[PDB]
């Protein structure tokens, strides 16, 4: 019943220098919210990369309303690792729900 956003796909494999696109889906619930893109560091700390209300990491909303493209522009081999998104709801209920994590390989 918590219904956290999804972070598609569990694994991106890309080549260095290439556009890498995750897609974070926050179902409906589009009245007062902020959407963060995170990457985990070796020490399991969470680093913000971009946010939907806002240049290497771009987050763009899709026509859907519910789907968001979270993309690395110039892929690298140290840009490589594990990522997730967080949905911050402000109304009706104050909430953060984070997606499950996915891997970027490049």
């Amino acid at each position, epitope marked *: *019943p*918590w219904n*956290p956003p999804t972070f598609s796909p569990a694994l991106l494999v890309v080549t260095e220098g290439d556009n890498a696109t995750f897609t974070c889906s926050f179902s409906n619930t589009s009245e*007062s919210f*902020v959407l*963060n893109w*995170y990457r*985990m560091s070796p020490s*399991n*700390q*969470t680093d*913000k990369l971009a*946010a939907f*209300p806002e240049s290497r990491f771009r987050v763009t909303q899709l026509p859907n309303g519910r789907d968001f493209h979270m993309s690395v522009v110039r892929a690298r081999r140290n840009d490589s690792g594990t990522y997730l998104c*967080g949905a*911050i709801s*402000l*109304a*009706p*209920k*104050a*909430q*953060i*729900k*984070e997606s499950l994590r996915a891997e970027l390989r490049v």
Partner: antibody
Amino acid sequence: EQQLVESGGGVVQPGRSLRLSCAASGFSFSSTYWLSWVRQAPGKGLEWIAAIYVGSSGNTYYANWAKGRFTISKDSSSTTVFLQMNSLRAEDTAVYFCARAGGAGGGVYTLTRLDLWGQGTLVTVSS
Amino acid sequence: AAQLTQSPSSLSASVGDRVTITCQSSQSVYNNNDLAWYQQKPGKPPKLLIYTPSSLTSGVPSRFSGSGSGTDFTLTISSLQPEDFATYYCLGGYDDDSDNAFGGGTKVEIKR
């Protein structure tokens, strides 16, 4: 190194107002965080008053009993949150804590996840 | 309007004892588990013990566990330690955050 420090407590006379401050250290107010005021009268239990989303939108959340008598506000530029307390009455004598909720990596966050606290400031309402 | 009842108001136990503290809500908490438990010691701010909706990876020793869903919640200390004597508080969150409230607290004191 993250810290909350409450100030502005002291003796206040009944029927008057008092503004309290919560000064945060070690983090910025852009997003994922709410600051809350919680109070505790001498020898009694904890009581939640209100919360504010730090960050542009600035949404406020007020306990039912506190609505219309307390006002919470923020100043991102000095990472400070304010609690305005009006029509003070004797039963308002208490220690006032501010507490933070939110972050990243914890999976789910709500206003019940208060994981960072100040030491609190004593307000005595008395003539 | 939500009212959150905590029981008992105080109890006495010995080190090693199992203690259960219960917390009951007028209405279902948010998503049936927006409920937390806090430990407070005299003169000190409260400390978060259990965050039900996503069990902490913090330093709660195994002896602390929460159970319950919806309107009735339990905090269990399976093997009470000297550092556990303190007052414990539940905190409930609701569809409207304006209803959020603490229970009245449970003081756990040393039996003799």
